[PDB]
Write a protein that binds this ligand. Structure first.
Ligand SMILES: *[C@@H]1O[C@H](CO)[C@@H](O)[C@H](O)[C@H]1NC(C)=O
Ligand SMILES: *[C@@H]1O[C@H](CO)[C@@H](O)[C@H](O)[C@H]1NC(C)=O
Ligand SMILES: *[C@@H]1O[C@H](CO)[C@@H](O)[C@H](O)[C@H]1NC(C)=O
Ligand SMILES: *[C@@H]1O[C@H](CO)[C@@H](O)[C@H](O)[C@H]1NC(C)=O
Ligand SMILES: *[C@@H]1O[C@H](CO)[C@@H](O)[C@H](O)[C@H]1NC(C)=O
Ligand SMILES: *[C@@H]1O[C@H](CO)[C@@H](O)[C@H](O)[C@H]1NC(C)=O
Ligand SMILES: *[C@@H]1O[C@H](CO)[C@@H](O)[C@H](O)[C@H]1NC(C)=O
Ligand SMILES: *[C@@H]1O[C@H](CO)[C@@H](O)[C@H](O)[C@H]1NC(C)=O
Lengths: 251, 299, 50, 50, 50
């Protein structure tokens, strides 16, 4: 059952204007719109983790920005909750080759949850009990050089997820440019989320590795911009510097 | 005046009248299952209230009057008589049982036992609540103990959030490590409805309906026949509940799959997508302009 | 030239305000509210535009 | 009993559309009281039509 | 009658446990906010009518 075979290392990196999503499902063109919501602040520091085949649990402060570039299909799903114990409720977003499953039950998580597959994926390594729950959900797979970005937040008992794909040449860190994120689902979970983790898949264990970035959202005010075809091509952070504040004031 | 001097004067301007009317609603045939909600044998407790999602159905809101002995709704942001003619994304139904004096706390802004420890509503609630007495069934004899409620909690809840933990709450700086008294209490305390309490102390039944506006494609709304599409003619239309008057035209805007509306500088609808045939159309008002009269003096 | 352009643009842009009501579209208020509250919501928009 | 709310200006439904319509500019008082002992009859009172 | 109440801690939440009244009808304040304000003196009257 529960085993400990993962160690993690941390490095620091800058963001360079990443984490912009569409604020609403309305078409606009050739306009400059001002929105106040939770965003990823420009030029912020993001921890870069390396998981090598112990790892603690990360906090969940008003949303999380998650990005990775691993093409080996080793990262799949996340855990969200407040104590990650069998005494409260917690989310279990899990992905596989054909569908995603989203459940929220009184799970009894292990210290180092992961998935083991042999020759047919198994699940016993994650928890022990799964009672007391009603909310299940299935849909198409979330995950298909390639950078994948996700944004999560919990407001008014609703869980929102955004995503985007971007073919990018290999680099030391995150690229420079703009690429807006589009919504996926707004679930009516209505639970308490304070801490979160990530899930890894191993073959039987055989050696493996993964790399991913983590960033936290904050309440800001942005000044987006739509081109003639309806795509967001630029943005301005109002609370970054006096020049940006002047641009926000003058619209 | 009865006398007009020489000059040019400006009078009322001309508008082009509409010819016919257009209605366009999606392909929905099945009926919403409100009977299994209202006419239910068992009703959940206030701390573990139940939420049921309703989608892809035609909702006849006047049927609910033939389902339970209640007087009227108390609706915020909408009106009870116009539940038809509007299309929503989803409809929810939160249901539980509370005490009579505490019904008034099911509303935005209320504070107390409920709305702080049991069931919180947001400040922008759209929807309303159906409440009625249930003395005959929920108060069989010598009280009841199936219905529980949280008595106290370390912090207030948040809109629509749920707490289900059954722990021991401390009142003194020592750890309880189980129930011991004078510091430790069991937060789930139960009232018991004897069939002799006062009017305010009798049990009640509550059903809350919450609506969200049109951002996703519409799934739930009432019966309405739909006509054909008429274009290049001034006409008044109805697309999933929005009204207006103008000219419908072929469009070339590149709507993304999750978008269904367009907006102008003044935040007025410009483009629209037909619910049945997913094509893009434009809306422009039919022509108008000023009129002037040139005359010499009536003398 | 710029004064007139800016004034007309501001006047056009002002139509998106709510002035304390629930919406800036008259048809939505008419469709979702009965006259007793529809008048109370609409007089605010009329006064603001005036 | 649950149909008293329909006797008012702007109301729509069954009674306010097929039996008794009030003007939107109505002025006056509307009073309604419960009447069960002298109205309801065992096996159903049937001489009341709508 | 008229009773003068002063120099004490007023808990307005416990009133619901003494008589079966549905709610309040308050004019210058709201029933939910009576737990925060601090008053000089309070006068309580009582009588029975039809
Ligand atoms: C992020 O944290 C690192 C700590 O190593 C620090 O050097 C860097 O200046 C921080 N970035 C900020 C505060 O923008
Ligand atoms: C992936 O998950 C779906 C949904 O639970 C399941 O039907 C399918 O069998 C799973 N595939 C594998 C290979 O386990
Ligand atoms: C489910 O919850 C009930 C009370 O809410 C509890 O008595 C029961 O033990 C729970 N089921 C478990 C822990 O498997
Ligand atoms: C917008 O779409 C038109 C359609 O022909 C295309 O020619 C143009 O290049 C597009 N613009 C951008 C910035 O993609
Ligand atoms: C509920 O359904 C039953 C059977 O269909 C019916 O007899 C009853 O009148 C309905 N309503 C109530 C309040 O029980
Ligand atoms: C969620 O859990 C945290 C940590 O235990 C607690 O401080 C917070 O109050 C909880 N949320 C609510 C709405 O009470
Ligand atoms: C909608 O229903 C009509 C008949 O009622 C049918 O002709 C049409 O093809 C349907 N459209 C869709 C998208 O199902
Ligand atoms: C009045 O006090 C007596 C004695 O404590 C108690 O039994 C009774 O219930 C009280 N009356 C009311 C209306 O609370």
């Amino acid at each position: 059952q529960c085993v400990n075979l993962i160690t993690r290392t941390q490095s620091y990196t800058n963001s360079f204007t990443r984490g912009v999503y569409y604020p609403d499902k309305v078409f606009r063109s050739s306009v400059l719109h001002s929105t106040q919501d939770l965003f990823l602040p420009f030029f912020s520091n993001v921890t870069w983790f390396h998981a090598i085949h112990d790892n603690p649990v990360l906090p969940f402060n008003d949303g999380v920005y998650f990005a990775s570039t691993e093409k080996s299909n080793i990262i799949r799903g996340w855990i969200f909750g407040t104590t990650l114990d069998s005494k409260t409720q917690s989310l279990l977003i899990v992905n596989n080759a054909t569908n995603v499953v989203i459940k929220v039950c009184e799970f009894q998580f292990c210290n180092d949850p992961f998935l083991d597959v042999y020759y047919m994926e198994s699940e016993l390594r994650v928890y022990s009990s799964a009672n007391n729950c009603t909310f299940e959900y299935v849909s198409q797979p979330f995950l298909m050089k390639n950078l994948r970005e996700f944004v999560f937040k919990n407001i008014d008992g609703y869980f929102k997820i955004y995503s985007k794909h971007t073919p990018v040449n290999l680099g030391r860190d995150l690229p420079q440019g703009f690429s807006a994120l589009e919504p996926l689902v707004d679930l009516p979970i209505g639970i308490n989320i304070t801490r979160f983790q990530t899930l890894l898949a191993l073959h039987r264990w055989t050696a493996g590795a993964a790399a991913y970035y983590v960033g936290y959202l904050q309440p800001r005010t942005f000044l987006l911009k739509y081109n003639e075809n309806g795509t967001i091509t630029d943005a301005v952070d109002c609370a970054l510097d006096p020049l940006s504040e002047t641009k926000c004031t003058l619209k | 005046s009865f006398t007009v001097e020489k000059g040019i004067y400006q009078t009322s301007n001309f508008r082009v009248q509409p010819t016919e009317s257009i209605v366009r609603f999606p392909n929905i045939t099945n009926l919403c299952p409100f009977h299994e909600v209202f006419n239910a044998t068992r009703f959940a407790s206030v701390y573990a209230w139940n939420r049921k999602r309703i989608s892809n159905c035609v909702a006849d809101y006047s049927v609910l009057y033939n389902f339970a002995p209640f007087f009227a709704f108390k609706c915020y942001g909408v009106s009870p008589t116009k539940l038809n003619d509007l299309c929503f994304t989803n409809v929810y139904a939160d249901s539980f049982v509370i005490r009579g004096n505490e019904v008034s706390q099911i509303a935005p802004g209320q504070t107390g036992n409920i709305a702080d420890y049991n069931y919180k509503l947001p400040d922008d609630f759209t929807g309303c609540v159906i409440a009625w007495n249930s003395n005959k069934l929920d108060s069989k004899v010598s009280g009841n103990y199936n219905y529980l409620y949280r008595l106290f909690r370390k912090s207030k809840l948040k809109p629509f959030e749920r707490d289900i933990s059954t722990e021991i709450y401390q009142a003194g700086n020592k750890p309880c490590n189980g129930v011991a008294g004078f510091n430790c209490y069991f937060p789930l305390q139960s009232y018991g409805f004897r069939p002799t309490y006062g009017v305010g102390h009798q049990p009640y039944r509550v059903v809350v309906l919450s609506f969200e506006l049109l951002h996703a494609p519409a799934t739930v709304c009432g019966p309405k026949k739909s006509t054909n599409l008429v274009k290049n003619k001034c006409v008044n239309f109805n697309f999933n509940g929005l009204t207006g008057t103008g000219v419908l035209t072929e469009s070339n805007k590149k709507f993304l799959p999750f978008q269904q509306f367009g907006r102008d500088i003044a935040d007025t609808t410009d483009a629209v997508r037909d619910p049945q045939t997913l094509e893009i159309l434009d809306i422009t008002p039919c022509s108008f302009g000023g009129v002037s009269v040139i005359t010499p003096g009536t003398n | 030239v710029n004064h007139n352009a800016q004034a007309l643009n501001t006047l056009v842009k002002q139509l998106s305000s709510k002035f304390g009501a629930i919406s800036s579209v008259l048809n939505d208020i008419f469709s979702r509210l009965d006259p007793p509250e529809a008048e109370v919501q609409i007089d605010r928009l009329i006064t603001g535009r005036l």
